[PDB]
Amino acid sequence: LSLRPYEFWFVTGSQHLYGEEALKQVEEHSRIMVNEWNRDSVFPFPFVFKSVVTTPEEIRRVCLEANASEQCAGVVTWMHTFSPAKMWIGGLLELRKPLLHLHTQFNRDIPWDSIDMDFMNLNQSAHGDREYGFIGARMGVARKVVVGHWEDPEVRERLAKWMRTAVAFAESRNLKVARFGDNMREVAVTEGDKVGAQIQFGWSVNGYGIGDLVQYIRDVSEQKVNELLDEYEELYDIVPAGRQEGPVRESIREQARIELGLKAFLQDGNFTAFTTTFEDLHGMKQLPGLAVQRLMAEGYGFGGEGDWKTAALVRLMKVMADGKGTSFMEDYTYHFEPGNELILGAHMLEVCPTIAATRPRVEVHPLSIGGKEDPARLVFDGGEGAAVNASLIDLGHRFRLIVNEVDAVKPEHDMPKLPVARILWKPRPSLRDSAEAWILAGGAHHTCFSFAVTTEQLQDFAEMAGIECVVINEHTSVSSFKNELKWNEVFWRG
Amino acid sequence: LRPYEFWFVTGSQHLYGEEALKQVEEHSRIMVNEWNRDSVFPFPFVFKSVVTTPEEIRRVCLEANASEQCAGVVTWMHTFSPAKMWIGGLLELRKPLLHLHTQFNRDIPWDSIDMDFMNLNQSAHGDREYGFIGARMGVARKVVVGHWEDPEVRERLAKWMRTAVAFAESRNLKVARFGDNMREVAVTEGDKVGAQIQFGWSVNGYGIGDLVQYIRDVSEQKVNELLDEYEELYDIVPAGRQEGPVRESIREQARIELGLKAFLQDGNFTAFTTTFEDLHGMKQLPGLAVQRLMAEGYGFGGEGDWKTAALVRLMKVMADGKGTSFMEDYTYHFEPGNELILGAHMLEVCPTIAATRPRVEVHPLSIGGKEDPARLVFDGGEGAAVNASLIDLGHRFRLIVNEVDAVKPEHDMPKLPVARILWKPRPSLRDSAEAWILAGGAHHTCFSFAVTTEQLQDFAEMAGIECVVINEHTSVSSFKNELKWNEVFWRG
Amino acid sequence: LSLRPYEFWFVTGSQHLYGEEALKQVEEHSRIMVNEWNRDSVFPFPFVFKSVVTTPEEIRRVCLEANASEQCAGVVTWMHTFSPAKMWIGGLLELRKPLLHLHTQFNRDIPWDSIDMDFMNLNQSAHGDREYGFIGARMGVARKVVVGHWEDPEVRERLAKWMRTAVAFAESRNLKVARFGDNMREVAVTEGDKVGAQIQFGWSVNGYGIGDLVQYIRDVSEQKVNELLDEYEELYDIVPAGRQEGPVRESIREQARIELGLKAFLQDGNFTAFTTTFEDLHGMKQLPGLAVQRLMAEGYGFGGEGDWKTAALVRLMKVMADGKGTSFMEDYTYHFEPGNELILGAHMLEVCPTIAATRPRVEVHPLSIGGKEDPARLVFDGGEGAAVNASLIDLGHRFRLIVNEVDAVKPEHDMPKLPVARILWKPRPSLRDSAEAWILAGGAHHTCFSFAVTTEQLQDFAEMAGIECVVINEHTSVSSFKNELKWNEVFW
Ligand SMILES: [Mn+2]
Ligand SMILES: [Mn+2]
Ligand SMILES: [Mn+2]
């Protein structure tokens, strides 16, 4: 599931004060930087040099162009020289693409023996970016600020990380979610204001009768079903029962039909995320399981029980990710053994095989929930490593993003009676403290779980989107966490 | 409705002795007794004790909370009744509250008035000290001033009773949604959790398939009996009186009506929604069936509009008479000196607002892509009415109320396959619509002949939401200003 | 003076989804936990199991009951399984009792060999308590949250401490203060809004003429006075000139009349706290001293100079306390010796003997303040140990609770000329910084000192009462403290 070709516009500020020659040197420096950056594979998207801007008219034009350009995912601005910031007001009011203020300098060191006035006029970001910094603060603009020399690998990795965050925000603005059925009845945290969500994030979330999907599923050709089954056998272990014709294999074959129906429905409307609900399965033989797991492994957002917020978050995080292993997740049960406290996460069927440590196995087991036939699903253990667990909730008058940093651990023991894929992890700073913090922030039971998204990225996304982001990690103290929630509350209100 | 009652609670104090307190109790008992003899009141009064200590006050407020029949509490300070004693109970009370500022005797007995009289009949100041604690605490309260035998006073009280019972119904209201919101529509979206917190409404989704199963279980005998009732209540189109396709269309609505009814009763719902975008397993869009359930007093909202469905149900309860419908502004008549709005829906207008006698008709309806639906066709009556919409502003709800005058049509509308009503909105079409749009009023409404503006304002007061009114006194420039000033008030 | 018994209601959330058999195991688990907890002596009050709730009605009913039961001091809720949180909205709107969310699990470990879908459906507090956590945050409920296994001793400690806090809050809601005389003239910090405090905390604070107390004292029988004197002799060292007959025994006898008169007045009115004032003592032979010190030893709240806020606070902390040693207190003078900085605390007369480390002696000395005769009082040195010093002030629009953690120390020198009881402490993080933070927070000069109340309890109480609680302890830096005062202020 691939992306339009995003790029990043590099805009360099200056002024006419010092003459035309100085301006040429500024332009030369900026082209060199863009050229050099583009050759570094740390960056996942190209930079494009978008000129030296020196007048209010220039600045506004490039902001206007950035807004209208679908491939422009973000703008990086750097004042090479002093660039009077009243000139930037028109542009900053216009721009609605994510903005990064790069505070840098072409040369690394001061050339002591030769530094003179011309040099001082030329290499003066030291004050040019401060004046630009002021107008940003003054206008209350959302901005990433990065400080450092432009060949410093730390600086580059921060830009590169930000690029993925900025791209996910472009995807967010155009995200379409399809709901097959409504929220699980009586459930609170999965409910919310869709209109409010479309305003804050750009998400278009709309409902379809399950019958609309049943229709697509009934148009699936058996030939394609057969091919898909072959692929299943190449990629996964199959339970012995399903190896030859008979009822177990027919159940697997049914999920194959569901997978193809979904893929078709979702592609036809250009949806990149979807929800189902076990409370509305009219005309289906099974709750989608294997089928949803496969679609998640291709990067679709998914949320159980009509949970569109998590479905959206899962898709965003898939785009943010610089690597494998992102999934819809739900905390299921705890292990409270002193000195070895952990959480077992899973869902009744739907966990993404990208987080798997072991070769996934196709199994068929009864599932009374939903009152349908025994669904086929992938069963596997999650891998180990540092990860984030994130939930996005609706507080009524605004949204809150909650992120827990965790460490997934390998299971030491088999769970042979457990028919679902699952993962274990120890939340930071402890089970007790993170759970308490989580509950105090009202974090959901559904999350996006990812080995490949960082806390900084989620916080950057929240800035772009104009919402609160709270983090629970190794440094968290519950008492300070509570105060922060109160103080953040007054700030984000209204 | 369930049985409802209203608690009269009289305040006093121990200062003037035990005999004084017996006299205030006699007065309070007599008032309740006389009130109960008057037909103006839709529910009975219950005399609760005279309360004179914080414990008694708190105890009666707790009981009112626990009592499902108690729809509201009417409080009156017969004598001075030190208001700190009232803090505890007011902190606890979750039933609507009316402060009746009244007096047993109407006139000052000039020739005999003495200090005993002055100690006993001093609501003039007792109710003011109580009024302070109400304001000081920010209690939502209705305040009525006048003598307890004044017909205006009783009439005000009786109307508030209806509002308070609507509120009690609101707090237990269950809506069933068959299918989701019409796709891409904004005004009918909103936060169900927020709504359950604010009004008590329970809004939950079911597959259209859940309803189909019910419709399929309908007794064919029951259908035939219902089909006959139709023949008796309505003018059926000629083609429909004989066996044939048309009569079969009418028969389908009968099955739909019976299946809906059964579903609703099973889950004790009093409002429901449908959407034409999700009718898998259905032969037609519910039409005639919805119109009848609306006549029985069910709330309904088209296109998954749960806010409107609940509003419709609420107003059906507030109403002291006939004629309450889900409604949508469909088209304008901009003829100078005769501007009006024609309201209707695809099918679903309530026959309780009919002037004429409803005709059962069958016409093609391309919306939803199902078979020709049977429905009741009629003209709406004439009269003063209200048209109300309840919207979600993101952080809070806003109730919007336009006062209007319904008018009988002067020209026939022979090609128009749906029931309709015509109204002239106060103060004019141009200003009413401008105000409605600035307030973000919805296209879906509840239209009623039998609900007053006062009632809707009292309900909004009970629920803790803004109520914006558009009437003959409305000026748009002023109106715009008040939205701003209200905004800063109701903003959390 | 003795504390009413209370209980704690344990309610467990579940749902119908998994069938009746799973609901039976939920109930079995919950019964087992309540039974096992009630065997554990760490809990000062019992749990009562109050059903597994699975519908909006059940949830609503049990919160309504919880509200109306005077024996119920708190509710402890645990979602054993997923328990959809819109069902909880109605009950949460109803509950005014303190609420603790216990995030626990019946089994401590995952049974790796056995775990299957049944187990996953049953023991899913991991997500059920999160959905529940959301609705509490979404609705802005004041809640204590405790996480860990139900057999973890630390978990049980936390629940236990909170039980005492919750019981102090119940007492708070019914607390009645008697004031004998007004505030000391021109004093600011002891003044406040009594109405606002009754709304916020529940306290009833009312004034009586000193003459009222005087009538009670005059009614005391001399026989009782004689018996009280014998108890003085048995509990305390009496100054030798006081054991004989004469003026100073007569002075001790006069304090015993006051004690008995006071005790009788307070009991007749159900008061559990009181204030006196040296400026209004008409009819009294002495400023109450020994008398007050004895009432405080019984657990009565006291505040000097008409200070009702501290009197109330002292009483609440007496209830909160899980051990001996709680007193009204005033910083009187400093010791600025380098490396040995400390505060000497005392009052005119009134320091509770429960903080004493020496056996109190009954002594008689002149007191010019008040213009009355030489009062008898108890004299002693307070003991060493970690404690808190707390003040509650009125900022005009809201209350602020201020708590300083301190370390009481043994005096190295006798104070032979000092006629009052006293205690020395070293405030955290240092005298200089502590005092600066205290003054910035505007903390009173009158406090409640206690060896037996934790900061966590006072913080939990403030949360129950909906007020700011500022803590000054070893970690305080003044600059950071200033910031938080500003940020808290915008929130509150
Ligand atoms: Mn789930
Ligand atoms: Mn419509
Ligand atoms: Mn003092």
DSSP notation for B471-492: STT--HHHHHHHHHHHHHHH--
C-alpha B103: how far from its chain's center? 31
Distance from C-alpha of B421 to C-alpha of C432, rounded to nearest angstrom = 80
Q: Which two tokens stand for residue A238?
A: 């199959």
Cβ neighbours of C18 (radius 10 Å): 19
Q: Which two tokens stand for residue B180?
A: 């989701």
Cβ neighbours of C453 (radius 10 Å): 29
Interface of B with A in 198-217 (CB under 8 A): 204-210, 212
Distance from C-alpha of C342 to C-alpha of C424, rounded to nearest angstrom = 7
Centre of ligand 1 to C-alpha A445, Å, is 7
Query: Prior bond to A419 cis, omega within 30?
Result: no
Q: Which of A186, A194, A214 sits opposite B189 (nearest CB)?
A: A194
In order, the DSSP letters of B342-403 are: EE--SS---GGGBSSPPEEEE----TTS-PPPEEEE-BB--EEEEEEEEEE-SSSEEEEEEE
Q: Is the dihedral of CA C252, C253, C259, C265 positive or negative?
A: negative
DSSP letter for B59, please. Answer: H
The answer to whether A285 and A217 have CB atoms below 8 angstroms apart is: no
Residue positions of C in the annotated binding site for Mn(2+)? 305, 330, 347, 446
Which strand ranges, in their side-by-side order, compose the sheet holding A144-147? A47-53, A7-13, A72-79, A99-103, A144-147
Q: Which domains does chain B have, with CATH numbers?
A: 1-172 (3.40.50.10940), 173-492 (no CATH)
Q: Which two tokens stand for residue B242?
A: 């004989």
Distance from C-alpha of B344 to C-alpha of A317, rounded to nearest angstrom = 46
Is the Cβ of A283 closer than 8 Å to some Cβ of chain B?
Answer: yes
Q: Which two tokens stand for residue C144?
A: 């204590």
DSSP letter for A226, please. Answer: H
Distance from C-alpha of B243 to C-alpha of B225, rounded to nearest angstrom = 15
DSSP letter for C183, please. Answer: P
Centre of ligand 1 to C-alpha B185, Å, is 27
Q: Distance from A476 to chain C by nearest Cα, in Å?
A: 16
The answer to whether A362 and A236 have CB atoms below 8 angstroms apart is: yes
Q: Which two tokens stand for residue A105?
A: 């300098």
Phi and psi at residue C162, to the nearest 5°: -70, -30
Centre of ligand 2 to C-alpha A305, Å, is 27
Taking an 8 Å cut-off on Cβ atoms, the answer to whether C148 and A336 are in contact is yes
- Packing angle of the helix pair C431-440, C478-491 (nearest 10 deg): 20
Question: How many helical (H) and strand (E) elements, i.e. helices and strands, does chain C have?
Answer: 16, 19
For tokens 């059926």, what's the residue? Answer: B236
Taking an 8 Å cut-off on Cβ atoms, the answer to whether C67 and B92 are in contact is yes
Is the Cβ of C142 closer than 8 Å to some Cβ of chain A?
Answer: no
CA nearest neighbour of B397 among B447, B464, B461: B464
Rounded to the nearest 10°, the torsion over CA B252, B253, B258, B259 is 70
For A376, the enclosing helix (H) or strand (E) is strand A376-379
Distance from C-alpha of B363 to C-alpha of B414, rounded to nearest angstrom = 13
Question: How many helical (H) and strand (E) elements, i.e. helices and strands, does chain A have?
Answer: 15, 19
Is the Cβ of C96 closer than 8 Å to some Cβ of chain B?
Answer: yes
Q: Which of B84, B137, B200 sits opposite C90 (nearest CB)?
A: B200
**Closest ligand to Cα C275:** 3
Taking an 8 Å cut-off on Cβ atoms, the answer to whether B280 and A283 are in contact is yes
CA nearest neighbour of C457 among C398, C387, C372: C387
CA nearest neighbour of C377 among C286, C264, C279: C286
C-alpha A107: how far from its chain's center? 35
DSSP letter for C428, please. Answer: S
In order, the DSSP letters of B213-280 are: HHHHT--HHHHHHHHHHHHHHSEE-HHHHSSSHHHHHHHHHHHHHHHHHHHHHHHT-SEEE--TT--T
Q: Measure CA of the first residue to CA of the last residue in chain B; give whole Å.
A: 35
A412 is in an annotated binding site: no
Phi and psi at residue B113, to the nearest 5°: -60, 125
A-chain CB neighbours of C110 within 8 Å are 333-335, 344, 415
Is the Cβ of B62 closer than 8 Å to some Cβ of chain C?
Answer: yes
Half-sphere exposure (CA, 13 Å, Cβ side) for B211? 28
Distance from C-alpha of A276 to C-alpha of A177, rounded to nearest angstrom = 11
Q: Which of B84, B136, B193 sits opposite C86 (nearest CB)?
A: B193
Centre of ligand 3 to C-alpha C451, Å, is 21
The answer to whether C459 and C473 have CB atoms below 8 angstroms apart is: no
For tokens 């209370």, what's the residue? Answer: C6
For tokens 């090479």, what's the residue? Answer: A80
A413 is in an annotated binding site: no
Distance from C-alpha of A378 to C-alpha of A356, rounded to nearest angstrom = 10
Centre of ligand 1 to C-alpha A368, Å, is 15
**Closest ligand to Cα A306:** 1
**Closest ligand to Cα C130:** 1
Query: Prior bond to B427 cis, omega within 30?
Result: yes
Interface of A with C in 413-452 (CB under 8 A): 413-420, 431-433, 435-436, 438-445
For tokens 């109605």, what's the residue? Answer: C90
CA nearest neighbour of B189 among B177, B206, B198, B207: B177
Distance from C-alpha of C384 to C-alpha of C391, rounded to nearest angstrom = 21
For chain A, the residues before each gap (C–N > 2.5 Å) are none
Dmax (CA) for chain C in angstroms is: 86
Centre of ligand 3 to C-alpha C183, Å, is 11
Distance from C-alpha of B442 to C-alpha of C279, rounded to nearest angstrom = 67
The answer to whether A215 and A253 have CB atoms below 8 angstroms apart is: no
Taking an 8 Å cut-off on Cβ atoms, the answer to whether B94 and C93 are in contact is yes
Beta bridge partners of B70: B5
Burial group, residue A342, by CB count within 10 angstroms (0-12, 13-18, 19+): buried
DSSP letter for A304, please. Answer: G
For tokens 């006629």, what's the residue? Answer: C419
Q: Which two tokens stand for residue B278?
A: 């999700």
The answer to whether A366 and A381 have CB atoms below 8 angstroms apart is: no
Phi and psi at residue B205, to the nearest 5°: -100, 140
Distance from C-alpha of A414 to C-alpha of A467, rounded to nearest angstrom = 42
Q: Which of C89, C90, C198 sits opposite B87 (nearest CB)?
A: C198
What is the CA angle B122-B124-B128, rounded to 5?
115
C396-408 burial by CB neighbour count: b if 16+ within 10 A, else e?
eeebbbbbbbbeb
Distance from C-alpha of C153 to C-alpha of C155, rounded to nearest angstrom = 5
B-chain CB neighbours of C56 within 8 Å are 202
The answer to whether C475 and C433 have CB atoms below 8 angstroms apart is: no
Interface partners of B (3+ CB pairs, < 8 Å)? A, C
Interface of A with C in 384-403 (CB under 8 A): 393-396
Distance from C-alpha of B154 to C-alpha of B150, rounded to nearest angstrom = 7
Q: Is the dihedral of CA A234, A237, A239, A240 positive or negative?
A: positive
Q: Which two tokens stand for residue A470?
A: 């709270």
CA nearest neighbour of B300 among B318, B282, B280, B315: B315
Resolution, Å (one decimal): 2.3
C-alpha A136: how far from its chain's center? 26
A-chain CB neighbours of C148 within 8 Å are 336, 432
Centre of ligand 2 to C-alpha A51, Å, is 52
The answer to whether B350 and B445 have CB atoms below 8 angstroms apart is: no
The answer to whether A1 and A299 have CB atoms below 8 angstroms apart is: yes
What is the CA angle C449-C454-C460, rounded to 5?
115
CA nearest neighbour of C299 among C175, C485, C420, C114: C175
What is the CA angle B370-B371-B375, rounded to 5?
110
The answer to whether A491 and A462 have CB atoms below 8 angstroms apart is: no
C-alpha A403: how far from its chain's center? 12
Distance from C-alpha of C467 to C-alpha of C465, rounded to nearest angstrom = 6
Interface of B with A in 287-316 (CB under 8 A): none
B395 is in an annotated binding site: no
Amino acid at A281: L
Distance from C-alpha of B302 to C-alpha of B185, rounded to nearest angstrom = 12
Mapping DSSP to helix (H, G, I), strand (E, B) and coil, where does residue C232 land?
A: helix
B-chain CB neighbours of A217 within 8 Å are none
The answer to whether A372 and A366 have CB atoms below 8 angstroms apart is: no
Interface partners of C (3+ CB pairs, < 8 Å)? A, B
Q: Where are the alpha helices (DSSP H) in C355-416?
A: none
Cβ neighbours of C283 (radius 10 Å): 14
Neighbours of ion ligand 2 (CB under 5 A): B 302, 328
Q: Which residue of A has its CA nearest to C148?
A: A432
Distance from C-alpha of A316 to C-alpha of A174, rounded to nearest angstrom = 11
Is the Cβ of B369 closer than 8 Å to some Cβ of chain A?
Answer: no
- Residues contacting residue B22 through CB under 8 Å, at least 6 positions apart: none
Q: Which two tokens stand for residue A83?
A: 């660039």
Mapping DSSP to helix (H, G, I), strand (E, B) and coil, where does residue C485 land?
A: helix
Neighbours of ion ligand 3 (CB under 5 A): C 304, 330
Distance from C-alpha of A112 to C-alpha of C485, rounded to nearest angstrom = 49
C-chain CB neighbours of B133 within 8 Å are 195
Taking an 8 Å cut-off on Cβ atoms, the answer to whether A442 and C152 are in contact is no
Q: Which two tokens stand for residue A24?
A: 């040429």
Centre of ligand 3 to C-alpha C190, Å, is 9
Distances from the Cα of A463 to the Cα of A320, B251, B259, angstroms: 15, 58, 51
Cβ-Cβ pairs closer than 8 A, A with C, add up to: 149
For tokens 């409002």, what's the residue? Answer: B271
Distance from C-alpha of C470 to C-alpha of C439, rounded to nearest angstrom = 12
Is the Cβ of C359 closer than 8 Å to some Cβ of chain B?
Answer: no
